[PDB]
DNA sequence: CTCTTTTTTCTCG
DNA sequence: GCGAGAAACAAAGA
């Protein structure tokens, strides 16, 4: 998932597990608990969930005053709320058992991660990863964005995916954003002009906020409607909305890349 | 049978 | 520092 899907999960979890005391925690794949499963089980068992936050694509469980559980779903992670007698499914790895239900984490590819960190270490955790601003008008400053693009020789799509210019874009929404902003994915950022950068900035905010409103593109968060609004991603060979052309797919920095050549010339 | 396809971080030259 | 390619992993499709 990307930021809109993680935000949709965050909102549903916030509605349902805040206030719940953790009765037990079980793992069939403890290796995804990067800080140590036995330590996490000891610290969090018997604690009450106080809230669920998000930063970029990271989910942040607020569990007691002094701990946060930082969860990343990577490529295929999925959460579901199940009854206590729910049968185990093949790719379930972790479960947080409450008195009247359980939160189960599944991940076919086993990429997703859990990290237990103390409350006063959350901001340093994200500083160390150099995560960029949240994609909102209030947080995403166009002036700094423009300066960073000017000083770099990177291609725009890889640079946006690095999470350092702005947080939360993945392969789907970066393709949608560059189509909407009429920018080639291999455009070198120091060749972007101010009016293009302005449109890119606004387009990032607008696409991600619309995606959040529509519940993401498609367990929790599986009821999104943003997939019906995608213009280029996964649409290889189909006609662009700025009509005439067919959507092409190339490889850029090892990622499948969907774009409309006429609309996105360098 | 092989090869390719679908977030983050590391290795290598 | 850089970028390309690979690594972590599983399943499905060509
Ligand atoms: F593909 C890419 F290599 F450009 C890339 N994509 C994503 S989603 C990403 N997240 C952190 N770093 C990242 N690099």
């Amino acid at each position: 998932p990307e930021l809109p899907e993680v935000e949709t999960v965050r909102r549903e979890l916030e509605k349902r597990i805040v206030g719940q005391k953790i009765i037990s925690i079980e793992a069939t794949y403890p290796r995804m608990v990067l800080t140590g499963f036995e330590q996490l089980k000891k610290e969090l068992t018997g604690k009450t969930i106080q809230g669920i936050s998000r930063r970029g694509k990271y989910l942040i469980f607020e569990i007691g005053d002094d701990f946060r559980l930082i969860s990343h779903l990577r490529m295929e992670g999925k959460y579901r709320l199940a009854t206590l007698d729910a049968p185990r499914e093949k790719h379930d790895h972790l479960t947080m058992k409450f008195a009247d239900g359980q939160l189960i984490y599944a991940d076919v590819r086993k990429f997703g991660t859990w990290e237990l960190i103390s409350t006063d270490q959350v901001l340093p955790y994200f500083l160390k990863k150099k995560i960029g601003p949240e994609p909102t008008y209030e947080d995403f400053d166009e002036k700094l964005f423009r300066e960073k693009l000017r000083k770099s020789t990177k291609k725009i799509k890889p640079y946006l995916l690095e999470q350092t210019l702005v947080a939360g874009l993945g392969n789907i929404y970066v393709d949608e954003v560059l189509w909407l902003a009429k920018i080639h994915p291999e455009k070198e950022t120091n060749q972007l002009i101010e009016s293009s950068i302005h449109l890119l900035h606004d387009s990032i905010i607008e696409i991600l906020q619309k995606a959040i409103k529509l519940g993401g593109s498609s367990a929790l968060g599986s009821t999104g409607k943003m997939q019906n609004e995608l213009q280029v991603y996964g649409k290889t060979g189909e006609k662009c909305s700025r009509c005439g052309a067919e959507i092409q797919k190339i490889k850029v920095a090892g990622r499948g890349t969907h774009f409309c050549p006429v609309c996105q010339q360098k």
Side-chain angles (χ1 to χ4, degrees), chain A residues 1-14 16-30 32-37 39-129 131-238 240-241 243-266:
Chain A
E2 307 176 31
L3 182 153
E5 293 72 32
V6 175
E7 177 58 22
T8 305
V9 178
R10 189 204 69 79
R11 287 170 183 201
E12 169 77 323
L13 287 176
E14 168 179 275
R16 297 184 63 190
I17 72 180
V18 169
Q20 295 279 339
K21 177 176 172 175
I22 298 168
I23 309 292
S24 66
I25 304 173
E26 305 180 1
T28 60
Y29 193 62
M32 63 163 290
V33 184
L34 305 190
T35 47
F37 175 71
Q39 170 197 88
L40 180 136
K41 181 194 184 75
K42 185 175 197 65
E43 293 289 357
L44 297 190
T45 291
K47 299 294 184 290
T48 298
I49 300 175
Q50 293 183 9
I52 321 288
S53 294
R54 184 193 47 69
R55 181 78 170 88
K57 305 167 191 169
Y58 298 74
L59 222 39
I60 306 164
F61 296 80
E62 300 157 358
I63 303 175
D65 272 357
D66 53 346
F67 281 119
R68 316 276 188 248
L69 173 55
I70 301 199
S71 158
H72 201 298
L73 295 72
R74 291 295 189 98
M75 291 291 283
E76 295 194 15
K78 301 177 160 54
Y79 281 103
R80 71 184 189 281
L81 289 162
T83 61
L84 290 175
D85 78 331
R88 158 137 215 284
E89 290 181 0
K90 178 175 183 184
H91 295 109
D92 297 346
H93 301 314
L94 304 175
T95 183
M96 225 182 254
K97 295 193 182 282
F98 312 111
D100 48 355
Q102 57 176 321
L103 175 68
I104 301 170
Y105 182 74
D107 191 332
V108 172
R109 299 186 71 186
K110 294 179 164 73
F111 290 168
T113 58
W114 276 14
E115 286 165 290
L116 176 80
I117 79 163
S118 64
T119 295
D120 61 12
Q121 288 307 302
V122 176
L123 297 178
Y125 173 98
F126 289 112
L127 290 175
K128 184 174 180 174
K129 290 179 186 306
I131 303 302
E134 292 297 312
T136 68
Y137 284 110
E138 321 84 86
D139 297 316
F140 185 20
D141 165 39
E142 183 174 326
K143 302 195 193 65
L144 178 62
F145 185 55
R146 179 167 62 242
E147 278 300 287
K148 294 197 167 181
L149 300 171
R150 176 186 67 81
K151 298 170 91 132
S152 172
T153 44
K154 298 177 184 181
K155 298 172 180 180
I156 182 61
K157 165 166 183 176
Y159 203 180
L160 290 172
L161 289 177
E162 290 172 13
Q163 307 301 292
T164 56
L165 296 164
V166 59
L169 290 165
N171 207 34
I172 300 181
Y173 296 113
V174 73
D175 281 4
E176 296 292 317
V177 153
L178 296 171
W179 177 82
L180 183 63
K182 313 306 169 191
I183 293 169
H184 194 293
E186 299 182 297
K187 177 72 158 178
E188 296 182 343
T189 69
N190 65 15
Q191 296 195 312
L192 293 167
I193 66 173
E194 193 167 318
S195 60
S196 295
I197 292 169
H198 177 58
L199 177 58
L200 176 65
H201 169 270
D202 290 357
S203 295
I204 293 167
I205 294 170
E206 298 300 340
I207 285 290
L208 290 183
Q209 293 307 324
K210 175 191 185 180
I212 290 173
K213 186 157 301 194
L214 289 195
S217 302
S218 294
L220 307 168
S222 60
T223 59
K225 295 182 295 183
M226 181 53 38
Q227 65 279 6
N228 300 321
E229 302 292 296
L230 305 177
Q231 303 298 304
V232 291
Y233 178 88
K235 310 244 176 181
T236 310
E238 304 173 34
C240 317
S241 203
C243 293
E246 295 189 0
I247 297 154
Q248 293 306 112
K249 189 187 181 177
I250 56 166
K251 285 232 164 296
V252 175
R255 303 304 294 277
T257 297
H258 313 81
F259 77 114
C260 192
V262 245
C263 296
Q264 297 169 262
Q265 287 294 98
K266 286 197 254 272

